[PDB]
Amino acid sequence: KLPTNLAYERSIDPSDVCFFVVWPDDRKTPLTYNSRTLLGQMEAASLAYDVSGQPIKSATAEALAQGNPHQVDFCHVPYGASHIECSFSVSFSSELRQPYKCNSSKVKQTLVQLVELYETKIGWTELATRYLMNICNGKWLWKNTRKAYCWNIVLTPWPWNGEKVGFEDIRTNYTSRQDFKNNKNWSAIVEMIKTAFSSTDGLAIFEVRATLHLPTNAMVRPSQVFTESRVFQSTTIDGERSPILGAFKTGAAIATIDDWYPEATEPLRVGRFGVHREDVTCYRHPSTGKDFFSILQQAEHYIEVLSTPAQETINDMHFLMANLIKGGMFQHK
Amino acid sequence: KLPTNLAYERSIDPSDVCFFVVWPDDRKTPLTYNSRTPHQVDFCHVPYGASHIECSFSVSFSSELRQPYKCNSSKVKQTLVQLVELYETKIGWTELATRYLMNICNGKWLWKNTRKAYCWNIVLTPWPWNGEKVGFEDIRTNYTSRQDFKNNKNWSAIVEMIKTAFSSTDGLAIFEVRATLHLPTNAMVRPSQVFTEKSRVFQSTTIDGERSPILGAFKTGAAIATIDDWYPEATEPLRVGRFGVHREDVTCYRHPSTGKDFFSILQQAEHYIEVLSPAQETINDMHFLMANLIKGGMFQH
Amino acid sequence: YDVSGQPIKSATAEALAQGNPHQVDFCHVPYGASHIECSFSVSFSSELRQP
RNA sequence: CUGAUAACUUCACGGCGGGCUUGAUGUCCGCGUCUACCUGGUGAACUGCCGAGUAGGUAG
C-alpha cells in the first residue's frame, strides 16, 4: 500500500488569459495598468488596541488621524472602448489510464483494472459535463462577471467538422444544467471528452473566446504575484505590459466540481484533503476517512463491488477518479 | 471575539470621473491642463468660448455584505449572518439607501467645483430599467432637502432596486451618472492631486490621446460615504471609518475612550440580537455597524 | 499520516488549509506567434569496428 | 643602585636535462496569494495699446 514511489500527471492542460480592448472601430489593443500611490486612514485594530487594553497614552486622537500612505497597481477600462475580450486554450488528454512512475506491479494492476471497470459500469458522462460546465459558463474570469451587462462565450474545438459553438447571454439563458443540454452542439462535445478519456492517444483541444460588457471606466481584477502593494502578474503583448490572470488559476476554476463531501453546499477545488478557502475549516479531513488516501487503500474493495449504490460507492468513485485527473505524488514511507 | 482572520469586501463600486468641454456647436473635447516649472506646479481652467463642462462616472450597488470573505470561525459566521438578516426585517434598508443616493443626486461628489456656479444638472441612467432617463434640473434652486427629492416622479423606483440589491442574494444595481456644470468664463477646475511623500501635481489619464485630470476613484468613493452623524453631539456628516476620523482638523471623534468605535460595538454582537428579536440609540449605532460592513476592511487581531 | 496510519495529531483541520508557496520556471509560446522551430545535428561514424 | 661596570662576526658563490589523463551517461512528477484606503491652491498675478501674428513689442 502506497509503495514509496507513485506519481501521475495531469490530463487537463490550460493556459493563461490575455485581456484585450476592442474599440468601436473593431481594432484591438492590449489592456494596460499603472502604479498609483494613495492615502488612507489608520484602520487596523492593533494600532489602537491590544488584548483587552488600549495602549499606554499612545492612542491619542491626534495620532489616529494621521495620513497613511500605501501604493497599489490600478487597472480599468479606457473611456470610449466598446467591450473586453478574453482568450485561452485548454486540451484534454488520456493520462489517467496508467501511472507515470509506479515502483510496484502489484498496485499497478489494481489501478489499471480500476480505470477499465469505471469506463464500463459508470462511465465518463458525469465527469465530462462538470469540467465543461465551467468552461462554457465563465467560472474562469472569477470576479469580472459581477457588475457586467452581458458576457458571451464562443469556442473552436479540434477536431471538428462544422462551425463554432456559441453561448449567448449567460444570466437568464444558460443557468441550470438542463439549459446547456438544449443546445444544438452539446451532445457532440461531450462525445469528444468521453473519447479522450477512453483512448490511448486521446486528444481534444478547445480554443475558448469570451466577450465582456462592463460599465464606464469600470475595473478589471486579474491575479497577483506572491512577493516572497497589490502587484499584478504580467507578460509582454506586442511590446506593452499587460495583465494575464495566470495559468494555475484558470485550471483551478475548471476543477471546481467537488460536491460529494459528506454535507455539501457548494463546489470545491478537488484536492487530497478537501480544503476550502473562504473559511479555513477543512472538510474531507483524514479523520472521517473520506479523503483521498483512505479510500485509495480500499482499491481492491471497490473493484469487486462493481463486478451499485450511489450513496457511498459511486460518490467515492467520482472523488477517486477526479484526483487521478488532477495528478500528483501519492506515496509515503 | 475577533478570531484573527476576518475580512469583508466592499459593496459600492465607483469609478474615475472624466472632464469634457462641450463647445456651442455640440462638440466635446477632453479638458487639458498646463504644467509649470522636482518643483512643478499645475494650472487648469475652462477654455474661452466654451459653453459648459461635463462629468461622467458609474457606480454599482452589489450584495457583498451578506457573508464575509474570510471568516476563520463558525461562531462569528452565523452571528454576523444573522445581524444583517435581522436588520433587513426590523429596521429596513430605507434609512441607508436614501442617504447614499442623495450624495449621488445633489452633486456632493463635485467637491469644490460647485462654488461659483450658475446652474448644474444631473442625469441618471439606471439598469435594469423599463422607462425614462431620470433628471435633476437646476439643483441649487430646486432640490435642497430630503423632501424635494421625495416629490420627484422617479424616486420610488431608485430608492427601490438598491433595497433589492442588498436584500436578495446575488443582487446588482448599476447607475450611470452625468452632470453639466455652467461655470463662469475662465473658471478654475479642481481635480485630485498626486501624493508625493515629502507641488499640486494632478492625477491624469489619457482620454482620446491627450492627457486629462480624473478627480480620482478613491476620491469619489469618499464623497458618497459621508453619511455619519451618529457620533455624539454631531454637527456635520463624516466619512464612515472605524474611529470617526475628521480630515480638515486633525482630530478624530468616535475614540475608544468614548466606547463608540466599531471594535467596541462589533464585540457586542450577541447583545443586540435580544432587542431586535427600542428606538433610542440601539438603532443609531447599527446604522454605523451596517455602514462598516458595506465599507469592507480587515477585522482581525 | 505518521508511518503507516494513526494521523499525527498536530495537523488539525485549519492547519492543513493554509498555503504552500513555491517557485518554478515557466516557459510558454507568446501570443500571436506562428510556430516553434527546433534544430539539432547528428553524426554517424565507424567507431565500433575495433576497440 | 639592574648575573653589575666595557664590547663591530666577516669576506666569496649557475640547480639542471626529458614528458599525451583518458573512455561512457534522460532529473523528474503536482500547485488560486488575497481582502480595505480623501493628500488638503478659499478670493488670490487684475485691464488696456501697437503690429496681419499662438512671433514680437508697449502701459498704470
Short mmCIF file of all heavy atoms in Angstrom, two decimals, chain D residues 7-22:
data_model
loop_
_atom_site.label_atom_id
_atom_site.label_comp_id
_atom_site.label_asym_id
_atom_site.label_seq_id
_atom_site.Cartn_x
_atom_site.Cartn_y
_atom_site.Cartn_z
P A D 7 80.70 49.61 25.18
OP1 A D 7 80.54 50.78 24.29
OP2 A D 7 79.56 49.11 25.96
"O5'" A D 7 81.24 48.41 24.28
"C5'" A D 7 82.43 48.54 23.51
"C4'" A D 7 82.99 47.20 23.10
"O4'" A D 7 82.86 46.26 24.21
"C3'" A D 7 82.31 46.54 21.90
"O3'" A D 7 83.28 45.85 21.11
"C2'" A D 7 81.37 45.53 22.55
"O2'" A D 7 81.06 44.42 21.74
"C1'" A D 7 82.15 45.12 23.79
N9 A D 7 81.29 44.69 24.90
C8 A D 7 80.07 45.20 25.26
N7 A D 7 79.53 44.63 26.30
C5 A D 7 80.45 43.66 26.64
C6 A D 7 80.48 42.70 27.65
N6 A D 7 79.51 42.55 28.55
N1 A D 7 81.55 41.88 27.72
C2 A D 7 82.53 42.03 26.83
N3 A D 7 82.62 42.90 25.83
C4 A D 7 81.54 43.69 25.79
P C D 8 83.76 46.44 19.70
OP1 C D 8 84.81 45.55 19.17
OP2 C D 8 84.04 47.88 19.84
"O5'" C D 8 82.47 46.31 18.77
"C5'" C D 8 81.92 45.04 18.48
"C4'" C D 8 81.08 45.05 17.23
"O4'" C D 8 81.54 46.12 16.36
"C3'" C D 8 81.16 43.77 16.41
"O3'" C D 8 79.90 43.51 15.78
"C2'" C D 8 82.22 44.11 15.37
"O2'" C D 8 82.13 43.36 14.18
"C1'" C D 8 81.98 45.59 15.13
N1 C D 8 83.20 46.32 14.77
C2 C D 8 83.48 46.63 13.45
O2 C D 8 82.68 46.29 12.57
N3 C D 8 84.61 47.29 13.15
C4 C D 8 85.45 47.63 14.12
N4 C D 8 86.56 48.29 13.79
C5 C D 8 85.20 47.33 15.48
C6 C D 8 84.07 46.68 15.75
P U D 9 78.86 42.52 16.49
OP1 U D 9 77.60 43.24 16.71
OP2 U D 9 79.55 41.88 17.63
"O5'" U D 9 78.61 41.38 15.41
"C5'" U D 9 79.33 40.15 15.45
"C4'" U D 9 80.39 40.09 14.39
"O4'" U D 9 81.20 38.90 14.55
"C3'" U D 9 79.87 40.06 12.95
"O3'" U D 9 80.73 40.85 12.13
"C2'" U D 9 80.04 38.60 12.56
"O2'" U D 9 80.17 38.37 11.18
"C1'" U D 9 81.32 38.26 13.30
N1 U D 9 81.57 36.82 13.49
C2 U D 9 82.82 36.48 13.94
O2 U D 9 83.67 37.30 14.23
N3 U D 9 83.04 35.14 14.07
C4 U D 9 82.16 34.13 13.77
O4 U D 9 82.51 32.97 13.94
C5 U D 9 80.89 34.57 13.28
C6 U D 9 80.65 35.87 13.15
P U D 10 80.22 42.23 11.51
OP1 U D 10 80.76 43.33 12.33
OP2 U D 10 78.76 42.12 11.30
"O5'" U D 10 80.92 42.31 10.08
"C5'" U D 10 80.58 41.40 9.04
"C4'" U D 10 81.82 40.86 8.37
"O4'" U D 10 82.40 39.84 9.20
"C3'" U D 10 81.64 40.19 7.02
"O3'" U D 10 81.59 41.14 5.96
"C2'" U D 10 82.86 39.28 6.94
"O2'" U D 10 83.98 40.00 6.44
"C1'" U D 10 83.13 38.94 8.41
N1 U D 10 82.79 37.55 8.79
C2 U D 10 83.82 36.83 9.31
O2 U D 10 84.93 37.31 9.45
N3 U D 10 83.53 35.55 9.68
C4 U D 10 82.31 34.93 9.56
O4 U D 10 82.19 33.76 9.93
C5 U D 10 81.28 35.74 9.00
C6 U D 10 81.55 36.99 8.64
P C D 11 80.75 40.87 4.62
OP1 C D 11 80.36 42.17 4.04
OP2 C D 11 79.74 39.82 4.88
"O5'" C D 11 81.80 40.23 3.62
"C5'" C D 11 82.82 41.02 3.03
"C4'" C D 11 83.94 40.15 2.55
"O4'" C D 11 84.45 39.39 3.67
"C3'" C D 11 83.58 39.09 1.53
"O3'" C D 11 83.48 39.60 0.22
"C2'" C D 11 84.68 38.05 1.72
"O2'" C D 11 85.85 38.46 1.03
"C1'" C D 11 84.97 38.16 3.21
N1 C D 11 84.40 37.04 4.01
C2 C D 11 85.27 36.39 4.87
O2 C D 11 86.43 36.80 4.95
N3 C D 11 84.83 35.37 5.62
C4 C D 11 83.57 34.96 5.51
N4 C D 11 83.18 33.93 6.27
C5 C D 11 82.65 35.57 4.63
C6 C D 11 83.11 36.59 3.91
P A D 12 82.10 39.48 -0.59
OP1 A D 12 82.08 40.61 -1.55
OP2 A D 12 80.98 39.31 0.35
"O5'" A D 12 82.26 38.13 -1.42
"C5'" A D 12 83.11 38.07 -2.55
"C4'" A D 12 83.33 36.65 -3.00
"O4'" A D 12 83.91 35.89 -1.91
"C3'" A D 12 82.10 35.86 -3.40
"O3'" A D 12 81.73 36.12 -4.74
"C2'" A D 12 82.54 34.42 -3.17
"O2'" A D 12 83.33 33.98 -4.26
"C1'" A D 12 83.45 34.56 -1.95
N9 A D 12 82.78 34.27 -0.68
C8 A D 12 81.87 35.05 -0.01
N7 A D 12 81.46 34.54 1.12
C5 A D 12 82.15 33.35 1.21
C6 A D 12 82.17 32.34 2.18
N6 A D 12 81.43 32.36 3.29
N1 A D 12 82.97 31.27 1.96
C2 A D 12 83.71 31.24 0.85
N3 A D 12 83.78 32.13 -0.13
C4 A D 12 82.96 33.17 0.11
P C D 13 80.21 36.44 -5.13
OP1 C D 13 80.27 37.32 -6.32
OP2 C D 13 79.48 36.92 -3.94
"O5'" C D 13 79.63 35.04 -5.59
"C5'" C D 13 80.06 34.45 -6.81
"C4'" C D 13 79.98 32.94 -6.78
"O4'" C D 13 80.26 32.47 -5.43
"C3'" C D 13 78.63 32.33 -7.17
"O3'" C D 13 78.85 31.09 -7.85
"C2'" C D 13 77.99 32.05 -5.82
"O2'" C D 13 77.01 31.05 -5.84
"C1'" C D 13 79.20 31.65 -4.99
N1 C D 13 79.02 31.87 -3.54
C2 C D 13 79.40 30.89 -2.63
O2 C D 13 79.91 29.84 -3.05
N3 C D 13 79.21 31.10 -1.31
C4 C D 13 78.65 32.22 -0.90
N4 C D 13 78.48 32.39 0.41
C5 C D 13 78.25 33.24 -1.80
C6 C D 13 78.44 33.02 -3.10
P G D 14 78.46 30.90 -9.40
OP1 G D 14 79.34 29.84 -9.92
OP2 G D 14 78.45 32.22 -10.06
"O5'" G D 14 76.97 30.33 -9.37
"C5'" G D 14 75.84 31.13 -9.72
"C4'" G D 14 74.74 30.36 -10.41
"O4'" G D 14 75.01 30.29 -11.84
"C3'" G D 14 74.51 28.92 -9.96
"O3'" G D 14 73.12 28.59 -10.07
"C2'" G D 14 75.25 28.11 -11.02
"O2'" G D 14 74.79 26.79 -11.17
"C1'" G D 14 75.00 28.95 -12.27
N9 G D 14 76.02 28.82 -13.31
C8 G D 14 77.36 29.03 -13.14
N7 G D 14 78.04 28.86 -14.23
C5 G D 14 77.11 28.53 -15.18
C6 G D 14 77.28 28.23 -16.55
O6 G D 14 78.32 28.21 -17.20
N1 G D 14 76.07 27.94 -17.17
C2 G D 14 74.86 27.93 -16.54
N2 G D 14 73.80 27.62 -17.30
N3 G D 14 74.69 28.21 -15.26
C4 G D 14 75.85 28.50 -14.63
P G D 15 72.03 29.16 -9.04
OP1 G D 15 71.47 30.38 -9.65
OP2 G D 15 72.59 29.21 -7.68
"O5'" G D 15 70.86 28.08 -9.07
"C5'" G D 15 71.06 26.74 -8.64
"C4'" G D 15 71.16 25.78 -9.81
"O4'" G D 15 71.33 24.42 -9.33
"C3'" G D 15 69.95 25.75 -10.74
"O3'" G D 15 70.38 25.57 -12.08
"C2'" G D 15 69.21 24.50 -10.29
"O2'" G D 15 68.37 23.93 -11.26
"C1'" G D 15 70.37 23.59 -9.94
N9 G D 15 70.02 22.50 -9.02
C8 G D 15 68.80 22.33 -8.44
N7 G D 15 68.73 21.28 -7.67
C5 G D 15 69.99 20.73 -7.76
C6 G D 15 70.51 19.57 -7.14
O6 G D 15 69.95 18.80 -6.36
N1 G D 15 71.83 19.36 -7.49
C2 G D 15 72.55 20.15 -8.33
N2 G D 15 73.81 19.77 -8.55
N3 G D 15 72.08 21.23 -8.93
C4 G D 15 70.80 21.46 -8.60
P C D 16 70.12 26.71 -13.17
OP1 C D 16 71.41 27.39 -13.40
OP2 C D 16 68.94 27.46 -12.70
"O5'" C D 16 69.74 25.93 -14.50
"C5'" C D 16 68.77 24.89 -14.50
"C4'" C D 16 69.37 23.60 -15.00
"O4'" C D 16 69.87 22.84 -13.88
"C3'" C D 16 68.42 22.64 -15.70
"O3'" C D 16 68.23 22.98 -17.06
"C2'" C D 16 69.11 21.28 -15.51
"O2'" C D 16 70.09 21.08 -16.51
"C1'" C D 16 69.83 21.47 -14.18
N1 C D 16 69.21 20.75 -13.04
C2 C D 16 69.97 19.76 -12.43
O2 C D 16 71.11 19.52 -12.85
N3 C D 16 69.47 19.09 -11.37
C4 C D 16 68.25 19.38 -10.93
N4 C D 16 67.77 18.69 -9.90
C5 C D 16 67.45 20.38 -11.53
C6 C D 16 67.96 21.03 -12.57
P G D 17 66.81 22.82 -17.78
OP1 G D 17 66.68 23.93 -18.75
OP2 G D 17 65.78 22.63 -16.74
"O5'" G D 17 66.95 21.47 -18.60
"C5'" G D 17 67.90 21.34 -19.64
"C4'" G D 17 68.18 19.88 -19.92
"O4'" G D 17 68.73 19.27 -18.72
"C3'" G D 17 66.96 19.04 -20.23
"O3'" G D 17 66.55 19.13 -21.58
"C2'" G D 17 67.39 17.65 -19.81
"O2'" G D 17 68.21 17.06 -20.79
"C1'" G D 17 68.27 17.95 -18.59
N9 G D 17 67.56 17.82 -17.30
C8 G D 17 66.28 18.21 -16.99
N7 G D 17 65.94 17.98 -15.76
C5 G D 17 67.06 17.40 -15.21
C6 G D 17 67.28 16.94 -13.90
O6 G D 17 66.50 16.94 -12.95
N1 G D 17 68.55 16.43 -13.74
C2 G D 17 69.49 16.37 -14.73
N2 G D 17 70.66 15.83 -14.38
N3 G D 17 69.30 16.80 -15.96
C4 G D 17 68.07 17.30 -16.14
P G D 18 65.09 19.69 -21.93
OP1 G D 18 65.11 20.31 -23.27
OP2 G D 18 64.57 20.43 -20.76
"O5'" G D 18 64.19 18.39 -21.99
"C5'" G D 18 64.09 17.61 -23.17
"C4'" G D 18 63.48 16.27 -22.86
"O4'" G D 18 64.12 15.74 -21.69
"C3'" G D 18 62.00 16.29 -22.50
"O3'" G D 18 61.16 16.29 -23.64
"C2'" G D 18 61.85 15.04 -21.64
"O2'" G D 18 61.73 13.88 -22.44
"C1'" G D 18 63.20 14.97 -20.94
N9 G D 18 63.17 15.47 -19.56
C8 G D 18 62.92 16.73 -19.08
N7 G D 18 62.98 16.81 -17.78
C5 G D 18 63.31 15.53 -17.39
C6 G D 18 63.53 14.98 -16.11
O6 G D 18 63.47 15.54 -15.01
N1 G D 18 63.83 13.64 -16.17
C2 G D 18 63.92 12.91 -17.31
N2 G D 18 64.23 11.62 -17.17
N3 G D 18 63.73 13.40 -18.52
C4 G D 18 63.43 14.70 -18.47
P G D 19 59.85 17.21 -23.70
OP1 G D 19 59.63 17.57 -25.12
OP2 G D 19 59.97 18.25 -22.66
"O5'" G D 19 58.67 16.23 -23.31
"C5'" G D 19 58.48 15.00 -24.00
"C4'" G D 19 57.68 14.01 -23.19
"O4'" G D 19 58.33 13.78 -21.91
"C3'" G D 19 56.24 14.41 -22.87
"O3'" G D 19 55.42 13.24 -22.84
"C2'" G D 19 56.35 14.93 -21.45
"O2'" G D 19 55.15 14.88 -20.71
"C1'" G D 19 57.40 14.00 -20.87
N9 G D 19 58.11 14.56 -19.72
C8 G D 19 58.27 15.88 -19.41
N7 G D 19 58.92 16.05 -18.30
C5 G D 19 59.21 14.77 -17.86
C6 G D 19 59.91 14.33 -16.72
O6 G D 19 60.42 14.99 -15.82
N1 G D 19 59.96 12.95 -16.67
C2 G D 19 59.42 12.10 -17.59
N2 G D 19 59.58 10.80 -17.37
N3 G D 19 58.78 12.50 -18.66
C4 G D 19 58.71 13.84 -18.73
P C D 20 54.61 12.74 -24.13
OP1 C D 20 54.29 11.34 -23.80
OP2 C D 20 55.34 13.06 -25.38
"O5'" C D 20 53.28 13.61 -24.13
"C5'" C D 20 52.46 13.69 -22.98
"C4'" C D 20 51.02 13.98 -23.31
"O4'" C D 20 50.69 13.40 -24.60
"C3'" C D 20 50.02 13.40 -22.31
"O3'" C D 20 48.94 14.31 -22.12
"C2'" C D 20 49.53 12.13 -23.01
"O2'" C D 20 48.24 11.72 -22.62
"C1'" C D 20 49.56 12.57 -24.47
N1 C D 20 49.62 11.48 -25.47
C2 C D 20 50.75 10.67 -25.68
O2 C D 20 51.76 10.80 -25.00
N3 C D 20 50.73 9.71 -26.63
C4 C D 20 49.65 9.53 -27.38
N4 C D 20 49.68 8.58 -28.30
C5 C D 20 48.50 10.34 -27.21
C6 C D 20 48.54 11.28 -26.27
P U D 21 48.90 15.24 -20.81
OP1 U D 21 47.91 16.30 -21.07
OP2 U D 21 50.27 15.60 -20.41
"O5'" U D 21 48.32 14.30 -19.67
"C5'" U D 21 46.97 14.42 -19.23
"C4'" U D 21 46.15 13.22 -19.65
"O4'" U D 21 46.09 12.24 -18.57
"C3'" U D 21 44.70 13.53 -20.02
"O3'" U D 21 44.33 12.71 -21.12
"C2'" U D 21 43.93 13.05 -18.79
"O2'" U D 21 42.59 12.70 -19.03
"C1'" U D 21 44.76 11.84 -18.39
N1 U D 21 44.54 11.39 -17.00
C2 U D 21 44.90 10.11 -16.65
O2 U D 21 45.45 9.34 -17.42
N3 U D 21 44.65 9.76 -15.36
C4 U D 21 44.05 10.54 -14.39
O4 U D 21 43.89 10.08 -13.26
C5 U D 21 43.68 11.84 -14.83
C6 U D 21 43.92 12.20 -16.09
P U D 22 44.11 13.35 -22.57
OP1 U D 22 45.39 13.17 -23.28
OP2 U D 22 43.54 14.70 -22.45
"O5'" U D 22 43.03 12.40 -23.24
"C5'" U D 22 41.78 12.13 -22.61
"C4'" U D 22 41.57 10.66 -22.41
"O4'" U D 22 42.16 10.23 -21.17
"C3'" U D 22 40.13 10.18 -22.31
"O3'" U D 22 39.53 10.03 -23.58
"C2'" U D 22 40.26 8.85 -21.56
"O2'" U D 22 40.51 7.79 -22.47
"C1'" U D 22 41.52 9.07 -20.71
N1 U D 22 41.24 9.16 -19.26
C2 U D 22 41.70 8.12 -18.48
O2 U D 22 42.31 7.18 -18.95
N3 U D 22 41.45 8.23 -17.15
C4 U D 22 40.78 9.26 -16.53
O4 U D 22 40.62 9.22 -15.32
C5 U D 22 40.33 10.29 -17.39
C6 U D 22 40.57 10.21 -18.70
#
